[PDB]
Design a protein around this ligand. Structure first.
Ligand SMILES: [Zn+2]
Ligand SMILES: [Zn+2]
Ligand SMILES: [Zn+2]
Lengths: 70, 259, 259, 70, 259
């Protein structure tokens, strides 16, 4: 019912922060190629200097404080 | 009750600029005159060594226009006021988030139209009071009262740029900061100093000395096989810019897009 | 019982500045006169080598106004007093936290209005005594007595800036520290020294020596192919600033936003 | 009944130690945004040079010397 | 039985300064006279090369006031005595810890009022004997005898600063250490030496030599294209300060806040 459900952040290093128009076109390409069941198994390609993915939540979530409730 | 022109609501998206004055405003109104560049070069005169011609205001203006464009790209900003006719796609998550829209150019002085169309026919045109804006970031958000995506569903019109600053040492978010003015001047000075550094003595001359019938003279210029004559000023300008630019980027912030 | 103008309560948000005097206060009242810059340049005179003209106060003021703006961005501060008309969004967690609000510009001298509106009509305007402020950080918090977010729900008006310091070697949190004054002067001196360094001898000249009929002279300037004539002063200014600025940042602290 | 229940220390590197007023405002923001059930799942953001969290106690505590008592 | 002014108890928070003398005390009482700066510059005279004018005491005082402010920020200290009207929030954990309070500025010479209010009306004003202080750190703690937080619940008034040292080579925790005096003088000398280094010979001159009709002379100054004329003294001052400051920081200690 509230936020905090993010899996992680995809960082892309660049000398300049890309203009928002470029990021919107990036999103358009990403959605057209990968979004949904359509193109689910495909792999994108990017030629940036360095890319990282930092995890904000664990691999698999589950209920917390179960024994406390019991 | 309230009085206003229908596109502009005082709450949310107050009118800031008359559309006609977009054509009127120019570089000189923002202080980007050749006088400012000459003032920063106080005590320095640039001229053709072979004639008495100093470079005219035409070159200064052409440099300034390129310099402001370079600042327009060093930061993702629209500086001079201008009208935009913008189409945007339908993404469900932001549509459900109060029809969030991030304009491609910022800041937004005012928004004139915000419509949804299917084949060029407006399916739904929202009331003026509903839509609200955030000027500096360019966000447009809608607050109604009483496949997962599609292309170019909605249509947005607005004015992008910054107004000249009205009061000393101050600026509203929809108003030009002084720093952009100084940054653009510094960019112009980088080109001017590149031109002027070649005209110190002759052409490609580093050292000189004459000795004729008892009369002797010697000069050593800043020019060197490894550095230019004006490289010192360019280095100082770059040092100043790398602090001014980074300081200014904090005022606008980093960019994000959901994916 | 108590006596006060309705917007200002002595407890929480005491009045500090008359709104009319916002227009009256200017740079000279804070000590940013050309005299201060000249004093720090005691024993140095800057002039056009080809004429007898020294640069006027116009250039000093224009430099100072840019310098204060640069300080206005090196730290996220509003320095000169000014009025702000500010809209803010509804975020549930801070709303439940006593309606916590962090103003976009700080410090806050006083708060004049704090209202909640739906379509431009004030749904609820809080009593003056309820709302309370923290001047330096700009926090506004409400203490009532006897989807998860929405956009631009509330409306806030206040005055942002710092007052001139009233007593020697002291300053209240709502009052200008001396360090900002010296920092701005140092920023101005960086530009002035950049202008003055080009006028030591001729233009682009590093070394000279004459020898005519038994009369001989020689001079070697600070100018070099790798450093400017005034690069020493600029280096010292940067060294001083990198300590003054970092020391001042501790007084305001780092920034946070919940996400 | 006595101390030693700390989980860890949150170190923030800075050239100067922040003034206590700034730390108090930092605490105010932290409490307003994150404290309690309200804003429990939210994530703060800080732009300091480097941050560390050093653990003083293990991940989960429990009774000690159980077999000795038995 | 005991005799005392009601706000001040000899046990815990003994009176140290009369409130009226806060206005009386100034820089000269602490030894920050222009004489001290001149004494540390013994054998050096600073003057305008083009006239016979030495810089007056006005510039020395203005430098000293900025220098003490810079020391006021290099360490989170209130140096000169001054009165503070301070509001603080209710945090349960410290409230239960004997109403622990850490004042925003330290040291505390004495505490005059400590009250709890709801809407400006004092709900409860504690007896004078109950509350106790720790002068150097600024802690205020209460020892009564015979949501989880709220904003600006309590009100605190006190005097922040350091008294002049009364006896040679000694200082109480509520009393100025000699080191702060020397540190502030050294900060002033950094600015003075920056001013004086430009007036050694001419302006921007590194080397000179004349030779006229058999009379010849030559001088080489400390000035260089990479270092200033007075950079040696500034370097030594920085070396001294980086030891004096770090040594002094151990006397006050690092800062903490619970979260
Ligand atoms: Zn953005
Ligand atoms: Zn803050
Ligand atoms: Zn402490």
């Amino acid at each position: 019912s509230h936020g905090g459900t993010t899996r992680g952040i995809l960082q892309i290093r660049s000398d300049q922060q890309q203009s928002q128009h470029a990021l919107e076109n990036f999103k358009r390409e990403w959605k057209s190629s990968l979004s949904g069941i359509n193109g689910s198994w495909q792999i994108p390609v990017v030629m940036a200097d360095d890319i990282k993915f930092v995890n904000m939540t664990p691999t698999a979530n589950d209920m917390q404080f179960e024994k406390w409730l019991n | 009750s309230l009085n206003y022109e229908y596109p502009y609501h005082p709450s949310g998206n107050p009118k800031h600029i008359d559309v006609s004055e977009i054509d009127n405003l120019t570089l000189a109104d923002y202080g980007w005159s050749p006088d400012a560049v000459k003032a920063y070069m106080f005590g320095i005169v640039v001229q053709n060594p072979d004639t008495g011609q100093p470079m005219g205001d035409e070159f200064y203006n052409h440099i300034l226009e390129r310099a402001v464009g370079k600042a327009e790209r060093a930061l993702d900003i629209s500086i001079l006021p201008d009208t935009q006719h913008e189409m945007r796609d339908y993404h469900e998550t932001e549509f459900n988030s109060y029809m969030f829209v991030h304009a491609y150019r910022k800041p937004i002085l005012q928004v004139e139209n915000l419509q949804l169309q299917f084949n060029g026919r407006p399916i739904y045109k929202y009331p003026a009071n509903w839509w609200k804006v955030e000027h500096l970031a360019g966000h447009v958000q809608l607050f109604p009262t009483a496949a997962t995506f599609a292309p170019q569903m909605i249509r947005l019109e607005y004015v992008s740029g910054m107004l000249p600053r009205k009061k000393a040492g101050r600026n509203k978010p929809w108003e030009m900061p002084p720093e952009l003015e100084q940054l653009v001047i510094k960019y112009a000075l980088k080109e001017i100093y590149q031109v002027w550094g070649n005209l110190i003595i002759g052409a490609g001359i580093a050292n000189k000395t004459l000795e004729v019938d008892g009369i002797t003279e010697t000069i050593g210029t800043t020019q060197s096989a490894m550095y230019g004559g004006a490289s010192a000023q360019i280095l100082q300008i770059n040092e100043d810019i790398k602090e001014l630019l980074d300081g200014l980027r904090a005022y606008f912030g980093y960019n994000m897009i959901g994916l």
